[PDB]
Amino acid sequence: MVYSYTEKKRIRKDFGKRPQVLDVPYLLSIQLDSFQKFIEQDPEGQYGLEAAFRSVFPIQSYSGNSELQYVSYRLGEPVFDVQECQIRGVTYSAPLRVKLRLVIYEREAPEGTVKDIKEQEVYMGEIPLMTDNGTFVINGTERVIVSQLHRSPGVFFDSDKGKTHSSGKVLYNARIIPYRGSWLDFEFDPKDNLFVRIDRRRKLPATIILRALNYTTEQILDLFFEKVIFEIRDNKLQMELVPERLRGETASFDIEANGKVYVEKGRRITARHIRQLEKDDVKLIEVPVEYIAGKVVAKDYIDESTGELICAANMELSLDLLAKLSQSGHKRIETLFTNDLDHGPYISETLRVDPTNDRLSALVEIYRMMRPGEPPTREAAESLFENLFFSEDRYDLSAVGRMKFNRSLLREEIEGSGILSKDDIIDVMKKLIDIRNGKGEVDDIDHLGNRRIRSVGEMAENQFRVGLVRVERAVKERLSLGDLDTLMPQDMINAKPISAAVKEFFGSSQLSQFMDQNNPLSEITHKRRISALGPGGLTRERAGFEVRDVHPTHYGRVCPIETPEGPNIGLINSLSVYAQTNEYGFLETPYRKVTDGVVTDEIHYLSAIEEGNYVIAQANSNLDEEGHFVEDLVTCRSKGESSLFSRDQVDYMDVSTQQVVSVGASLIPFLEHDDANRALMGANMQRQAVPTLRADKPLVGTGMERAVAVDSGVTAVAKRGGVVQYVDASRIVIKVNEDEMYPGEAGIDIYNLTKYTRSNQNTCINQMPCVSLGEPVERGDVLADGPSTDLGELALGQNMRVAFMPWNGYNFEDSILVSERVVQEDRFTTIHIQELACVSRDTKLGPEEITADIPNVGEAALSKLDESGIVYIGAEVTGGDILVGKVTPKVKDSSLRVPNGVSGTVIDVQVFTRDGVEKDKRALEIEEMQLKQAKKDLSEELQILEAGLFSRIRAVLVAGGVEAEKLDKLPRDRWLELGLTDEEKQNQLEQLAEQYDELKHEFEKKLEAKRRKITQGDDLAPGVLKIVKVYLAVKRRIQPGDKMAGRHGNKGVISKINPIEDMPYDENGTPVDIVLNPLGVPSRMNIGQILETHLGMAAKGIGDKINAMLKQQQEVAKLREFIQRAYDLGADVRQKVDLSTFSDEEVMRLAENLRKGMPIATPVFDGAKEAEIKELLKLGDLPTSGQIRLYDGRTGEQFERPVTVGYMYMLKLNHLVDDKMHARSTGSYSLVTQQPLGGKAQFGGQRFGEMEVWALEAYGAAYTLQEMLTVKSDDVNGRTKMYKNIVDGNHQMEPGMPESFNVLLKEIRSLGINIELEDE
């Protein structure tokens, strides 16, 4: 057994029992391997930019009769890396270069080119790149593309009751949904006439398509219907009985011959009669003329002699018609079999709607129904009809759509073309008619086998296609008209349409979300959201219980708990922990192979429609350490049904008890106990915790923290193994070991940590070291904590000591009462960093300046600016302080002032300048910083190679060919001028001094390039001269009104900040830190929070025994004994750990991190039994009831009965109150109508909205209302007369008439509608 060097510092005591056979996949492979799938070229041309290019090129005009064609593409390295790009505020992007070859043919000749011109990689655009954290950077702002989930291409059959006609019956419908191009709907009319339409246009008679494919009705009838024949021999019109065509229906008429009668008139027909029908060989039989007089004919019948019609396919027969046509010599008359149950006549019925004659008349009807007002025309019509279904420019089932289609038509194969074909539509019709004949089933729409995930690497491939589609339309024309003589490919194309397409996508699409960089969980659970909304999806306002609800295939694929309750429940889901995207995009999830009777430890991923074909055991099911099930019969799910089945009947097993959830819920301990309301609100509140100041560890967790904090990319992780060379909380630098070094390198990995910086939500993000100088580290160890982490565990909140009890009502209803001790400790203080910016311009009156020489203001304000016109770093500032002394010509003091209300310390400034514009000493101050920071880190390589190279001189001197009359005092390349002879050592000296010079020249260009990065200005917007951004850090504390939450979806405002003496304290005199209310636990059934408290209490107790054993100077062998006795506690828990191997050093180093509570894991559905919590509390010296008697610090009286006390984990949420408290006396008003502005970002007035006005009207209160909506609001006179009457204290109003109502009058009178006020 082994633990990595960052595990072996706080080995979380694990209570899990099921052995985790599959370790959690890298939590963002959803995203990264999607974008990698876009960005890689791939000669198997599907997927990626290359697939899109090969979707358009080769490209040509017929009249140009020449082409240009895509050869290959290259993607250059990005002009600025992520860190610098995120400073400079551009987007992190890469230049796209494409080998286009233009080919010039000739007339008359064979096509052999007159010339062709490979343009040496024409520039095509700048595609953004994904950062390894899975995020794009789009205008310095960091953005995330959520995966979409939408209806896969294919064919889908559907039906409903009551939603249509409601006379008990149901109507059936088929759709073909291509990936790109037109939708085709087939549907029956109630009277089972069949109809078709494109793109939800008008309804058409369905055979209009078969007509359009030029089947005659005779052929259609041979495609759809079974034949029944009459042979006019042995007697007039004998009949071809196929026996099985009579079963269950009544023999209402005479059928007999030759010996035993099968079934006489009026009786059902059955098997024994059919067998007698077979044994008599009923190949022809006598039937009454009423039977033939029922028929509809199959085939066309002219009279050959007159040459003229008597009957036609699907025309209906009668005795006299039969007589004349058989009399005309047509001795075989042929018709259809149409039993109403099994063979309904729907296509013949459709031929009774049909207005068409044949192909052309249908194409006429198509073109007139689709493009009303354009002329139909034989040469023109096909340029509609073919581009509906048969042409690549406008119809495309991708490979997934073809697969799904073929699977539903039960085809043998799935390598198929993306267009339809005649037989491809006909098969849909046949399958739809089988459904109406009752012999088939409709698909469940909302099934994760019918909806597939699209992620970034596919949405961007489509938007890039829209680009190439608009270049198609330009380049075809330019090629067709062009001379082909001077044009080269970089004339043929230009980037602007591609760049528009892709930049608008990544910038502004409904799915290019601005990342919730709130804390490391919220980064991740956002990068793996599954969204039903957006382009090609549904809409949040326009769906109902059919899709919001969970479905049985969600299990293991989508988390049922973690969805953002509100107007879009379940239109957003979170992709479950273990789930994965299949090749095609369907969600698939890993299961264990059950081989005969033993659970084999191999995992097969199952998609949602493989799963229904097996029976799959629930993850809890026990096994015998050989791996046979222990239970003789076991719970499994099967076909959405679940039940018990035999041992060795079951065929797959779940991989882990965590498989059903997302990371967002998988982090709740004891989830096994909570109402799924309160699980949901928990798993939504964890992603809102703001990173507190001094974050640590949850004492009770699930062991998922060790993964969320690492995979979220925000802790800095050791890229290669080695030893820590230096640390200073800004840099960490690692001497990588030679077993993982690359041979020419210096061999030294710096990590410049990010310090105090705004998150996208204004919380700070300073990384801090966890290493010590000279400490060893191994690849993948956490070197530095992120925000909200410590030692690499996720740590959103603080393990506050809580007791559950009423307290004089301060924790009524939900509220949290808090002791002053928590605020004094800086437990929940949090740092909020704002960014304020002053732009400056080349305006129409002339160019602005930044200066201290501001007009109309004296040193009373300017004392905080430097001499340049920017605030000093470390200035502490408040409302109205001038941060940046901008001024405008013709001079106007327009300068950046700190907005009202806010306050903070100015932690940093940045300065950006156009080209050809002068700097200033705060630009030179920033240059001095950044230059020096680049140069230092470069020197720490050049120094290391210089030292190595002079050793490489010294050693092969000192070992042999010594010249050491004096040695180390000398400049170690002046060592060359010593008198060594022209034996090889002097030539080694000369060569290695040339290697030393070239080592200098190497950095002599590397530092020049770096300084050139810093020396330059930046790509400002048009009009601006320069911009400066100034950052205010605020250390906000905690106060009444702030919100805190547990993990269990318990939440409250904190209501009072009680002084320590008022907190309850125990029989040992320690006060409780928080007092939660009890009644919420039964009333909202989230009792898992109690077991977290008790297990938390035990967690404190073990640290309590350890801390005592470190204050007392216990020897390690006794201390190790107690720690070991803690890890081995419980049943056959999964984990094993041997402090015997920890070398004493690391036992003390471990104890020094347990000494405030042993951290515990309670994996989600696999937790501690109660009997193991008691066992831990007994190992501490604690009361196993979990409860303690408490006393009230207001009197020292005892409380009656003990109360729960223990260490809950509590999160401060980002809804803290000073960010919401607001009030307005008077200030701005809007221009169009004079009502007040609305906001906090503007000094706004609260909306006395519509419902409040009914509320006043429902008291008698008329004067209040009159005021509220005029004098206080709108009447431009009355409010200034009111204000003066109030300062005069007159308490009287003059109410007038609101100016918004006069706006209405003019806006009506701006129609030709004379509205007017009237007098009497």
Binding site: F545, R548, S642, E672, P806, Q1039, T1264, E1307
Partner: protein
């Protein structure tokens, strides 16, 4: 308007008029230059099709756009509907002198107060503050007082605490379904930043305290203060508008405390002695000499208001408990002690409070309600009424009840395994076997909770009502009655599929114990349905109330008595057998339509237009009356309104 740098905001109409005027410039040209019919029919079409845009863009074949297919908002799009003047700016509009904050509970408030932050009061009341600094002559005028407020000088608070000293401020949450959703309170100043609201009133707002923001408005004029104090002040609104039922209905912790205070425990310290009054009952409690729920006898006095309305005071021994003696001290002097002499719970105390309003009236009732609140909080504290997992009680018969029912389900299965029962019958009987198990588990668990308390009566054990923590909360009506405790420790029971059809194998577990993965996953088909319903419903409910006020708003009570003799007839609603509502629900407080006779003949009982107030409806309940004819607003023959008598009792008064 210009925006960020030298760019005009795309100001839609000016793009529409621009279309028109361009087209008109061309059409004047091509008319005067005398173009042929086909050309002028072109421009004339394009002009008509442009003025079409300017009036009501998008009633055309397609709305015209100037961006990524954003339709430009035309005039008629400015008038109508949810973003247009009538709803957006006329009917309700933003207002000055307002602010908002997170509310938080303030237990010490008297019912009429709320605390609001000094920062807000100072930024809200500014006009009134200037109206004192000039009146002190301490500031020269606005120009100085503005600065003197900005500097936040030491005087200003003593001025503020004179400005505000009794100026009602209006607090309302949003949405605000009903009149009780805006109320006025006298403010009291606070150091923090939250609005301290009164505990009992949070229920009216449906203000939970979990971070639920609330807006405040100052009324400016004298008339707005007189309306606020007379009508909207919380003391004037103890009743619902909708039904004769209090809205001050006690907060869960208050009723928990009063339940705990008034129980009897058959063994206690100081049990069985005899006392001369509540005061020495309290000395006995507070010194720790008697336990609060100990049995005792006390001398009591109580008061009754006679047939005239004047007090008769009476005195007796009473047999009771220490805590019922202490609680009697809070009741105003006119109620009978028989209302307190019982272990109180949420229904029992609501009627307590209601009877106070019945007998004394409003002004004592609001103070009595305040005292109840303070009392319940204080004894609920001493009670230490915690919750703890050792207090979840599982009846061990549960194990047998499953192990029995499982085989009987397998009997239904074995018949099915022999074809001996139909595919419908197998299912619809199995789910009834699970129901028969579930009722038994629930019944055994409620018996076990009551069973957990038994104690030595100085010799031999005897049982009493269980002090088990979760059972106090159910049996008191604080929170979480039968349907919750059943799930916490009984069984979770049957669950339903998405299409409502029932699961063949229930959740026989409960949240004290673990759900396995499947039981949990099926559990979410419940809860996610219930959340989808909430988020989906909250639209249609609002569109319903809109349609209603916007049809009802034309009515006002406008005559005293329209003079009808017509009306409609009220009976208990008798259906499905028994009566689902008695007559005293329907008829109370309407006026009689016609003379109401004695059951029988010729004896009249109520004159023909008398309000049937409570003493009349109790009288009808003394009689064998079944049907009563009353006036109803549908029959009131007032034109353009309703007469008062036809409407009858005002429920809030």
């Amino acid at each position: 308007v210009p925006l960020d740098g030298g760019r005009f905001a795309t100001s839609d109409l000016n793009d529409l008029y621009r279309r028109v005027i361009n087209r008109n410039n061309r059409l004047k040209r091509l008319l005067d230059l005398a173009a042929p019919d086909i050309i002028v029919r072109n421009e004339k079409r394009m002009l008509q099709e442009a003025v079409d845009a300017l009036l009501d863009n998008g009633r055309r074949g397609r709305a015209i756009t100037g961006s990524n297919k954003r339709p430009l908002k035309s005039l008629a799009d400015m008038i109508k509907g949810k973003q247009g003047r009538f709803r957006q700016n006329l009917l309700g509009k933003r207002v000055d002198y307002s602010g908002r904050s997170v509310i938080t509970v303030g237990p010490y408030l008297r019912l009429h107060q709320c605390g609001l932050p000094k920062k807000m009061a100072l930024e809200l009341f500014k006009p009134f503050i200037y109206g004192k600094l000039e009146l002190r002559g301490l500031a020269t005028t606005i120009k100085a007082a503005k600065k003197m407020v900005e500097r936040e000088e030491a005087v200003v608070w003593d001025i503020l605490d004179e400005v505000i000293r009794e100026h009602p401020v209006l607090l309302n949450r949003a949405p605000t379904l009903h009149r009780l959703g805006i109320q006025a309170f006298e403010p009291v100043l606070i150091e923090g930043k939250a609005i301290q609201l009164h505990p009992l009133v949070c229920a009216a707002y449906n203000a939970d305290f979990d971070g639920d923001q609330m807006a405040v408005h100052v009324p400016l004029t004298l008339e707005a203060q007189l309306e606020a104090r007379a009508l909207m002040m919380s003391t004037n609104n103890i009743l619902s508008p909708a039904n004769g039922e209090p809205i001050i209905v006690p907060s869960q912790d208050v009723v928990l405390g009063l339940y705990y205070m008034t129980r009897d425990c058959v063994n206690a310290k100081g049990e069985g002695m005899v006392l001369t009054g509540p005061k020495e009952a309290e000395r006995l409690y507070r010194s720790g000499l008697a336990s609060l729920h100990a049995r005792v006898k006390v001398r009591i006095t109580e008061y009754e208001k006679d047939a005239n309305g004047e007090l008769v005071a009476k005195t007796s021994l009473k047999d009771t408990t220490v805590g019922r003696a202490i609680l009697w001290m809070i009741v105003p002097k006119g109620l009978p002690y028989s209302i307190v002499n019982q272990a109180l719970g949420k229904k029992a105390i609501s009627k307590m409070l209601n009877t106070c309003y019945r007998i004394l009236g409003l002004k004592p009732t609001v103070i009595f309600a305040d005292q109840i609140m303070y009392t319940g909080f204080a004894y609920a504290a001493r009670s230490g009424a915690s919750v703890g997992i050792d207090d979840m009680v599982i009846p061990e018969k549960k194990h047998e009840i499953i192990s029995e029912a499982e085989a009987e389900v397998a009997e239904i299965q074995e018949q099915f395994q022999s074809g001996l029962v139909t595919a419908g019958e197998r299912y619809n009987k199995v789910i009834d076997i699970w129901a028969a198990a579930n009722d038994r588990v629930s019944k055994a668990m409620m018996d076990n909770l009551q069973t957990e308390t038994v104690i030595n009566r100085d010799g031999q054990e005897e049982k009493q009502v269980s002090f088990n923590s979760i059972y106090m909360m159910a049996d008191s009506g604080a929170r979480g009655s039968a349907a919750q405790i059943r799930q916490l420790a009984g069984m979770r029971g049957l669950m339903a599929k998405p299409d409502g059809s029932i699961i063949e194998t229930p959740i026989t577990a409960n949240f004290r114990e673990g759900l396995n993965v499947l039981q949990y996953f099926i559990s979410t088909h419940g809860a996610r349905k219930g959340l989808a319903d909430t988020a989906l419903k909250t639209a249609n409910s609002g569109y319903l109330t809109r349609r209603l006020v916007d049809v009802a708003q034309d009515l006002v009570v406008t005559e005293d008595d329209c003079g009808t003799h017509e009306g409609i007839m009220m009976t208990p609603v008798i259906e499905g057998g028994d009566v689902k509502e008695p007559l005293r629900d329907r008829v109370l407080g309407r006026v009689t339509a016609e003379d109401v006779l004695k059951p029988g003949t010729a004896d009249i009982l109520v004159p023909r237009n008398t309000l049937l107030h409570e003493q009349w409806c109790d009288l009808l309940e003394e009689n064998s009356v079944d049907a009563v004819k009353v006036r109803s607003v549908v029959s009131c023959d007032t034109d353009f309104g309703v007469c008062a008598h036809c409407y009858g009792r005002d429920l809030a008064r």
